[PDB]
Amino acid sequence: MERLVWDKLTLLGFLEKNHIPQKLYYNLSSQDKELSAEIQSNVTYYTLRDANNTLIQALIPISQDLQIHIYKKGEDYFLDFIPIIFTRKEKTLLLSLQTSPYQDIIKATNDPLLANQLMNAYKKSVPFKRLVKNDKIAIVYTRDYRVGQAFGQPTIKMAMVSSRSNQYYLFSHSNGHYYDSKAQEVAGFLLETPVKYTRISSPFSYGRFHRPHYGVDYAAKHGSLIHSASDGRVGFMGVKAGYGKVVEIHLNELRLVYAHMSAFANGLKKGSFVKKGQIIGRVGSTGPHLHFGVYKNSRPINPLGYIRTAKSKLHGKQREVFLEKAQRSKQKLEELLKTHSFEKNSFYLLEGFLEHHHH
Ligand code: NI
Ligand code: NI
Ligand SMILES: [Zn+2]
């Protein structure tokens, strides 16, 4: 297949451009239409054409693990939402600061995405802002690959920065949030419910085997006020097929989506800075509901996990398992730092983490 980069088309625009009957979109359920609205610009997608240059297949990612599959069978086109098959690689970055955290990470990885994730993860960290030459930064992270090619964003499993001989750790969890070594949340966001809803008509779902919905649908009256769940900056504001009128707001590594609006607030525009609690529009059905979506580092995440008044902590068996892994991870990081000298090199980018050792 040809590997290409998505630019500005909608699904419908893509169908039109390639002479695929547009009913393939119009016939979708409203849930599938919402799903189809999340094709991001710059995603890598795949196409296959026949001798006539007719589009006979396409694979278009809508998340890190779901994609649209369009294919011609006999005389007709079909559209499925299917899993993405991928390979995951783990690396360990070990770094002695030479210039700035950001520049050094780029030097060692050539990856702005990872560098931005670290800055964001430590955004409120006082020791982080006070890092100086020869302070240490370690990151254990994974990246996902499709036929050899990385896609989406990396995932930080563990990070550590040292300042004045003290080490400041954070760890990911399968729930998508970061935790310190006492299993309490760090680098969180306190989001507020953005509308007065009558009920949640459809919660967030990965749709995973034991259905995918990448937001929360809040049933509300047409015209109900919609308030920003957070501070941030408006990125997009307008109409997207499947979402109707929508506002997107960015804050650190979050993108927050508010869809199906009947109207935007007067004077709101692309680039507007907004405050948590500020009115950004009104509920519509462009019956009525607000679709509220949250994306961390490009990946959809359950918004409800961040609507809380306090910082989260892990509990029960989740806490036990976490702390066990955290201890093992900390011990292993020390061993790796002992066995890779910053006299020889300012950084090391190592294959794997727990299994990494020499002979
Ligand atoms: Ni090594
Ligand atoms: Ni061995
Ligand atoms: Zn929805």
Residues 6 or more apart in contact with residue 209 via CB below 8 angstroms:
none
Q: Which residues on adjacent β-strands are paired with residue 290?
A: 218
d(CA 161, CA 124): 13
d(CA 247, CA 269): 9
- Judged by its nearest atom, the ligand closest to the C-alpha of residue 356 is 1
- Judged by its nearest atom, the ligand closest to the C-alpha of residue 344 is 1
| Chain-centre distance for alpha carbon 294 | 8
On whether the CB atoms of residues 141 and 155 are closer than 8 A, the answer is: yes
Q: How far is the CA of 218 from the centre of ligand 3 (A)?
A: 8
d(CA 68, CA 71): 10
| Tokens, residue 29 | 């359920």
User: DSSP letter at 310?
Assistant: S
Q: How far is the CA of 92 from the centre of ligand 2 (A)?
A: 17
d(CA 18, CA 43): 18
| Tokens, residue 170 | 């954070």
Q: How many residues does the chain have?
A: 359
Same domain as 23, residue 12: yes
- In order, the DSSP letters of 193-250 are --S--SEEEE--B-------BSSEEEE--TT-EEE-SS-EEEEEEEEETTTEEEEEEE
- Judged by its nearest atom, the ligand closest to the C-alpha of residue 259 is 3
Same domain as 303, residue 201: yes
Q: How far is the CA of 357 from the centre of ligand 3 (A)?
A: 46
Q: How far is the CA of 123 from the centre of ligand 1 (A)?
A: 30
Same domain as 287, residue 226: yes
| Amino acid identity, position 228 | S
d(CA 95, CA 168): 14
What is the CATH classification number for the domain harbouring 262? 2.70.70.10
The radius of gyration of the chain from alpha carbons, rounded to an integer in Å, stands at 22
Q: How far is the CA of 100 from the centre of ligand 1 (A)?
A: 24
Same domain as 95, residue 70: no
Of 37, 58, 84, which marks where a domain is finished? 84
Same domain as 118, residue 27: no
User: DSSP letter at 137?
Assistant: E
Same domain as 210, residue 77: no
CA angle 44, 349, 324 (to 5 degrees): 95
Same domain as 202, residue 175: no
Helix (H) or strand (E) segment spanning residue 35: helix 30-36
3-state secondary structure of 294: strand
The residue behind tokens 């070594």 is: 181
**Resolution limit in angstroms?**
2.0
Torsion of CA 117, 140, 180, 254, to 10 degrees: 20
Of 63, 84, 105, which marks where a domain is finished? 84
Q: How far is the CA of 356 from the centre of ligand 1 (A)?
A: 6
d(CA 354, CA 197): 46
Q: Which residues are annotated as a binding site for Zn(2+)?
A: 34, 213, 217, 291
d(CA 91, CA 86): 16
Q: Which residues on adjacent β-strands are paired with residue 3?
A: 46
Same domain as 39, residue 8: yes
On whether the CB atoms of residues 27 and 20 are closer than 8 A, the answer is: no
Residues 6 or more apart in contact with residue 187 via CB below 8 angstroms:
120, 121, 122, 123, 124, 170, 178
Of 84, 114, 134, which marks where a domain is finished? 84
Same domain as 159, residue 253: no
Residue closest to 225 by CA, chosen among 248, 195, 262, 203: 195
Q: How far is the CA of 359 from the centre of ligand 1 (A)?
A: 10
Residue closest to 36 by CA, chosen among 208, 204, 213, 205: 213
The whole domain housing 334 covers 85-188+311-359
- In order, the DSSP letters of 78-126 are EEEEEEPP-EEEEEEEEEE-SS-HHHHHHHHH--HHHHHHHHHHTTT-H
Q: How far is CA 43 from CA 19, 40, 113, in A?
A: 22, 6, 14
Q: Which residues on adjacent β-strands are paired with residue 134?
A: none
On whether the CB atoms of residues 349 and 356 are closer than 8 A, the answer is: no
Q: Which residues are annotated as a binding site?
A: 34, 213, 217, 291
Half-sphere exposure of 243 (CA within 13 A, CB side): 27
φ, ψ at 238 (rounded to 5°): 165, -150
